[PDB]
Write a protein that binds this ligand. Structure first.
Ligand SMILES: [Cs+]
Ligand SMILES: [Cs+]
Ligand SMILES: [Cs+]
Ligand SMILES: [Cs+]
Ligand SMILES: [Cs+]
Ligand SMILES: [Cs+]
Ligand SMILES: [Cs+]
Ligand SMILES: [Cs+]
Lengths: 123, 121
DNA sequence: CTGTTAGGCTTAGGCTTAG
DNA sequence: TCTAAGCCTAAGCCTAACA
């Protein structure tokens, strides 16, 4: 019944969220924890820690639908982007594969599910 | 050049009567009607054979028809029923216009939705 | 298995550009 | 210093199948 107002996700929101995800993945690799950013528990924790104004379910849906397809265009270091693509399970179509290989000077190995199997930093 | 065709008063009358009947049916079924969605207008376009698309209808209803409902050539009982059972905001100016045109006193809530009205006739 | 995580619906809000 | 067809995206939240 209540008429809702909607606030967009900003570029700064994406920078903060992606850096959070990267650091938590690195620490989880050191400690042996498997984090799942496409779940909801990760975003429960993110919302508690950052005290975001947005809900965890909203963050999960948005991350899966908007942030993951746009990760390769983020204003982030290319090594960070490649680590995230390799360790999160983000689809990369053929055209995007070529675009990434060209703009990052890398060699991608992408599977039949279009997930990133591996990469070589050819620089 | 894409020619555009305005919604007519007849379009609005048929759409509002359809919405009224669907609201009555939803009340009897105990379900919530969602005329600002898309499925409702898919069903409407199918039933009425209107030549405009469902997405066009949904946008138009939300943005044009709801703010203009009080000006419709419909019985004020139906207009006030629709205002009461659809999320339609009523600002102070529109509230006064309604009270004068229909000879009623409106009780409008903090969400600027119609709570109730008293017929002064 | 209860968390993950695809996919559906509403409807708020943006773009293009005809009237 | 326009309004709003015509269509769209996606915020926001949800469900449901699979593991
Ligand atoms: Cs914050
Ligand atoms: Cs991957
Ligand atoms: Cs209402
Ligand atoms: Cs599980
Ligand atoms: Cs799943
Ligand atoms: Cs748009
Ligand atoms: Cs116009
Ligand atoms: Cs579902």
């Amino acid at each position: 019944k209540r008429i809702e107002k909607r606030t967009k996700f900003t570029v700064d929101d994406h920078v903060v969220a992606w850096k959070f995800i990267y650091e938590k993945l690195v620490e989880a690799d050191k400690e042996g924890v498997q984090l799942m950013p496409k779940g909801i528990a990760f975003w429960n924790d993110f919302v508690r820690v950052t005290r975001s104004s947005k809900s965890a379910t909203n963050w999960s849906s948005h991350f899966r639908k908007i942030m993951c397809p746009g990760l390769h265009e983020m204003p982030l270091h290319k090594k960070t982007i490649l680590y995230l693509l390799k360790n999160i399970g983000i689809e990369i179509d053929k055209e995007t594969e070529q675009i990434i290989e060209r703009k990052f000077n890398v060699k991608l190995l992408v599977g039949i599910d279009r997930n990133l199997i591996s990469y070589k930093l050819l620089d």
